[PDB]
From a paper:
Complex I couples the transfer of two electrons from NADH to ubiquinone (Q) with the translocation of four protons across the membrane. The L-shaped complex is structured into a peripheral arm that protrudes into the aqueous milieu and catalyzes electron transfer with one FMN and 8–10 iron–sulfur ([Fe–S]) clusters, and a membrane arm embedded in the lipid bilayer that mediates proton translocation. We have determined structures of the electron-input module of complex I from the hyperthermophilic bacterium [name], encompassing subunits [name] and [name] that contain the FMN cofactor, the [4Fe–4S] cluster N3, and the [2Fe–2S] cluster N1a, respectively, both in the air-oxidized and dithionite-reduced states at resolutions up to 1.8 Å. Here, we show that the redox state of N1a regulates NADH oxidation in complex I by inducing a conformational change close to the NADH-binding site.
To determine the mode of nucleotide binding, crystals of [name] were soaked with NAD+, with NADH and with NADH plus dithionite, leading to refined models at 2.0, 1.8, and 1.9 Å resolution, respectively. The structures of NADH and NADH plus dithionite-reduced [name] were virtually identical. Noteworthy, in the NAD+-bound state, the peptide bond between E95F and S96F faces the FMN as in the oxidized protein without nucleotide, while in the NADH-bound state, the peptide bond is pointing toward the loop coordinating N1a as it is in the structure of the reduced protein without nucleotide. Remarkably, the reduced nicotinamide group penetrates significantly deeper into the binding pocket than its oxidized form placing it in an optimal position for hydride transfer. The amide carbon atom protrudes 1.65 Å deeper into the binding pocket changing its distance to the Cα carbon atom of Glu95F from 5.37 Å to 4.03 Å. The two positions of the nicotinamide in the binding pocket are here called tight (NADH in reduced [name]) and loose (NAD+ in oxidized [name]). Water molecules that are here resolved for the first time play an important role in substrate binding by forming hydrogen bonds between NADH and [name]. The E97F side chain binds the NO2' of NADH by a connecting water molecule. One water molecule bridges the backbone amide of G394F and the side chain of E184F with the NO1 of NADH. In [name], the carbonyl group faces cluster N1a in the reduced state enabling binding of the nicotinamide in the tight position.
Author numbering:
A (entry chain A): 6 to 160
B (entry chain B): 2 to 418
Write the structure that this text describes.
C-alpha cells in the first residue's frame, strides 16, 4: 500500500505543521477518512512510519477517537445528535424522516455506499435542535420535505 | 472564503462586548476587526510588561469561563512562578450538552479570540500557543486557520511581533470525537499525539503540562475577555456586572424556550430573567419543570430566582440553560444524561468505567419497565458510586444531575417503580 500523491502531500503538510511530527496524527487521520470515506486498515502502517510512531500507537488512537470508522466506507456521513436537547426537540422525527428518504437507520449504510447514519453526542448547536451534520456541513432539521431538499445537494 | 454550512444560532447582547460583532451570524475578517479598534489592546499589551498584564487580568476578577470558574490571573501567576519554556492553550473542545457559547466567538469573531491568545501568551512568556478545537467544529477550524494567516500577514504573529522582541506561533489542533479531550490534561495528551486520557492532578498543567512544561489552559470565552481588560483597564472592566463576579458572560439557552440562542448578560441576571426576560419565556407558555446546567446540575422551578454567577448559591457552571417544561419526562431526560456519560468515560478508573456503563444500562431497564427490584437497588448504588478513585471531573459528576432529579422529582421516579 502507497498513499496517492494528492493525499501524501496533504499528510506531509499536517506532519510539518506542528513542532513535533506525532502531534499531526488526528489531522492526518481526518484527511485519510475524507479521502477514502473511512479509515482503510492498510493506511495505518505507512501513516505510523510518516509520524515516526509504532503501529500499535496509531491503532490505539484510531480505536479511541469516535469520529474515525475503519469498518464502513461512505461518501457522506449523516451525524445525528442523540443527546438531551435534540431528543427533547425531535431526534426521533429526524431519524423517522431519514428512514423514509434513504431507507436506513443509525449505524447502517445505503446500498450504493452513498450515505451512512452515525448517532453522535451533543454537537454544540443545541439552540438549533434537532441537529444533524452531512460530512462537514451542519443543519437544523425542520421537516422531511426540508431534509429531502438538503440531502439532494449531496450527489 | 468558503466554509462548511453552520446553523445560524441566534445571539443577543445587553453589553456589546463579546458579541459586538458575533451578534451577526457571519465571519468578521481582519479588516472589519481592525475598523473596530481590533489588535490595539495587543499593541498596548506589548508596551506593558508580562507582569503588569497578569496583575490587570488578576484585578479584573476574571474567572474561568470553561465551567469551573478558577481565577484567571491566579492561574497565570502559578505558571510564571515555574521556569520556562511555557505553553499557552486555548480550550475550544466545547462538548458539554447544551453548550454552544464558544463556537459563536470562534466562527464569527475569530480575531477577538486570536488577540486574546497573543496577549495571554505574552503575559505568561509562551512563544508557542495552541487552539484545540473539537473535530465536530470543522467550519470553526478552517475559520481559525484563515484568521491566523490574516494575523501573521498583518504582523500580529511570528517573530518579533511589532518590534517588541516577542515571538509567537499559534497551532490549531482538531479533536476527533472524545468529550474527555476537553478535560485539560486529556487535551494535553491529545496535543501530544496520544489517546485522550486525563492525568492525575496535582500536578496542574501550570506546574507540568505539555511536554512536562508549565502550561496554561484557558477556555475560548475566558480568553475573549483578555482584549477588553487591556483595552478598558481592569477598573472599568470591573464596573461590568457585580464587583464580586465581574464582566460579560455568555449564556447558551436551549430547549423549550421561545428564543433559543446565546445571550451576553451580566452575572447578576437571575435564571428566571434569562428564560423569561431574555429568551422570551417558554414554548407554548407551558410551566418550566427543570433547568439542566449542561450535564452537570438540575434546578427545579423553585430555584429560578438564583444569580447566574460563580457564588455558592449561584447557577455557576458554563452558564448553559437547557429548559424542560411540564410535559417533559424527567426520567427520559435522566436517561439521556446517563447515556452521555456512558459514551464519554475514558475507562481509566474502574468505578467511572463500570459506573457510567451500569447507570445507563440500569436506567434504560427502569425507563422501559424491564427493571427487576435488584436492578432498581443496583441503579441507586451505582449512581452514588461513580466518583471513587476518579482522576478527573467526569467520574466526579457522572451521577450528580441524575441524583438531583431523584431528590427533586421523587414523584416521577416513583411511577417508574
Ligand atoms: N465548556 C464545556 O463544553 C465543558 C465540558 C465539560 C465540562 N466542562 C466544565 O468543566 C468543569 C470542571 O473542570 P475541571 O475538572 O478542570 O475543574 P477544576 O475546578 O479542578 O479546575 C479549573 C481550572 O483551575 C486550575 N486549577 C485548579 N486548582 C488549581 C491549583 N491548585 N493550582 C493551579 N491551577 C489550579 C485547573 O488546572 C483548571 O485549569 C465543570 O464545572 C464543567 O462545567 C465544560
Ligand atoms: C470531562 C471534562 C471535559 C471538559 N471539557 C471542557 C471543554 O470542552 N472546554 C473547556 O474550556 N473546559 C472544559 N473542561 C474544563 C477544563 O478541564 C479546564 O477547567 C478549563 O479549560 C480551564 O479554562 P478556564 O479556567 O478558562 O475555564 C472540561 C473538564 C472536564 C472534567
Ligand atoms: S474519572 Fe472517568 S473520564 Fe475521568 S480519567 Fe477516570 S475513567 Fe477517565
Ligand atoms: S443536544 Fe444535540 S446539538 Fe446539543
Ligand atoms: Na474532542
Amino acid at each position: 500500500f502507497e498513499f496517492p500523491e494528492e493525499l501524501k502531500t496533504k499528510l506531509q503538510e499536517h506532519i510539518n505543521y506542528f513542532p513535533k511530527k506525532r502531534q499531526a496524527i488526528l489531522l492526518c487521520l481526518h484527511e485519510i477518512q475524507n479521502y477514502y470515506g473511512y479509515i482503510p486498515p492498510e493506511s495505518l502502517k505507512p501513516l505510523a512510519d510518516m509520524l515516526e510512531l509504532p503501529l500499535n500507537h496509531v491503532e490505539g488512537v484510531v480505536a479511541f477517537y469516535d469520529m474515525f470508522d475503519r469498518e464502513d466506507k461512505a461518501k457522506y456521513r449523516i451525524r445525528v445528535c442523540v443527546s438531551i436537547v435534540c431528543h427533547l426537540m425531535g431526534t426521533n422525527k429526524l431519524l423517522k424522516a431519514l428512514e423514509n428518504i434513504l431507507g436506513i437507520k443509525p449505524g447502517e449504510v445505503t446500498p450504493d455506499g452513498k450515505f451512512k447514519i452515525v448517532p453522535v453526542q451533543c454537537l454544540g448547536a443545541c439552540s438549533e435542535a434537532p441537529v444533524f451534520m452531512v460530512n462537514d456541513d451542519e443543519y437544523k432539521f425542520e421537516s422531511e420535505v426540508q431534509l429531502n431538499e438538503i440531502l439532494s445537494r449531496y450527489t | 472564503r468558503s466554509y462548511p454550512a453552520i446553523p445560524r444560532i441566534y445571539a443577543e447582547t445587553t453589553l456589546n462586548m463579546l458579541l459586538k460583532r458575533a451578534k451577526k451570524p457571519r465571519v468578521h475578517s481582519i479588516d472589519e476587526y481592525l475598523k473596530d479598534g481590533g489588535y490595539q489592546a495587543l499593541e498596548k499589551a506589548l508596551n506593558m510588561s508580562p507582569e503588569e498584564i497578569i496583575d490587570w487580568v488578576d484585578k479584573s476578577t476574571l474567572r474561568g469561563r470553561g465551567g469551573a470558574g478558577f481565577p484567571t490571573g491566579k492561574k497565570w501567576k502559578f505558571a510564571v512562578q515555574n521556569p520556562g519554556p511555557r505553553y499557552f492553550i486555548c480550550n475550544a473542545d466545547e462538548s458539554e450538552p447544551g453548550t454552544f457559547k464558544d463556537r459563536i466567538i470562534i466562527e464569527r469573531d475569530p480575531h477577538l479570540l486570536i488577540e486574546g491568545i497573543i496577549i495571554s501568551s505574552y503575559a505568561i512568556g509562551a512563544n508557542e500557543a495552541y487552539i484545540y478545537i473539537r473535530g465536530e467544529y470543522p467550519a470553526g477550524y478552517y475559520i481559525l486557520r484563515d484568521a491566523i494567516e490574516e494575523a501573521k500577514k498583518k504582523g500580529f504573529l511570528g517573530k518579533n511581533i511589532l518590534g517588541s522582541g516577542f515571538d509567537l506561533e499559534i497551532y490549531v489542533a482538531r479533536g476527533a470525537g472524545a468529550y474527555i479531550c476537553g478535560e485539560e490534561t486529556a487535551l494535553i495528551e491529545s496535543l501530544e499525539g496520544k489517546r485522550g486520557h486525563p492525568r492525575l492532578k496535582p500536578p496542574y498543567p501550570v506546574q507540568k503540562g505539555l511536554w512536562g512544561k508549565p502550561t496554561v489552559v484557558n477556555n475560548v470565552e475566558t480568553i475573549a475577555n483578555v482584549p477588553f481588560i487591556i483595552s478598558m483597564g481592569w477598573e472599568e472592566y470591573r464596573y461590568i456586572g457585580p464587583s464580586d463576579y465581574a464582566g460579560p458572560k455568555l449564556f447558551p439557552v436551549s430547549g423549550k424556550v421561545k428564543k433559543p440562542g446565546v445571550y451576553e448578560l451580566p452575572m447578576n441576571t437571575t435564571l428566571r430573567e434569562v428564560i423569561f426576560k431574555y429568551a422570551g419565556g417558554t414554548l407554548g407558555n407551558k410551566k418550566v419543570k427543570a433547568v439542566f446546567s449542561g450535564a452537570l446540575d438540575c434546578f427545579s422551578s423553585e430555584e429560578l430566582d438564583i444569580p447566574m454567577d460563580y457564588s455558592p448559591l449561584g447557577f455557576g457552571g458554563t452558564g448553559t440553560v437547557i429548559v424542560l417544561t411540564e410535559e417533559d419526562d424527567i426520567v427520559e431526560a435522566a436517561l439521556k444524561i446517563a447515556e452521555f456519560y456512558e459514551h464519554e468515560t475514558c475507562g481509566q478508573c474502574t468505578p467511572c468505567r463500570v459506573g457510567c456503563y451500569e447507570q445507563a444500562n440500569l436506567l434504560e431497564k427502569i425507563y422501559k419497565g424491564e427493571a427487576t427490584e435488584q436492578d432498581w437497588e443496583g441503579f441507586d448504588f451505582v449512581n452514588r458510586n461513580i466518583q471513587p478513585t476518579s482522576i478527573c471531573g467526569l467520574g466526579a459528576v457522572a451521577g450528580r444531575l441524575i441524583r438531583q432529579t431523584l431528590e427533586k422529582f421523587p414523584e416521577e421516579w416513583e411511577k417508574y417503580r
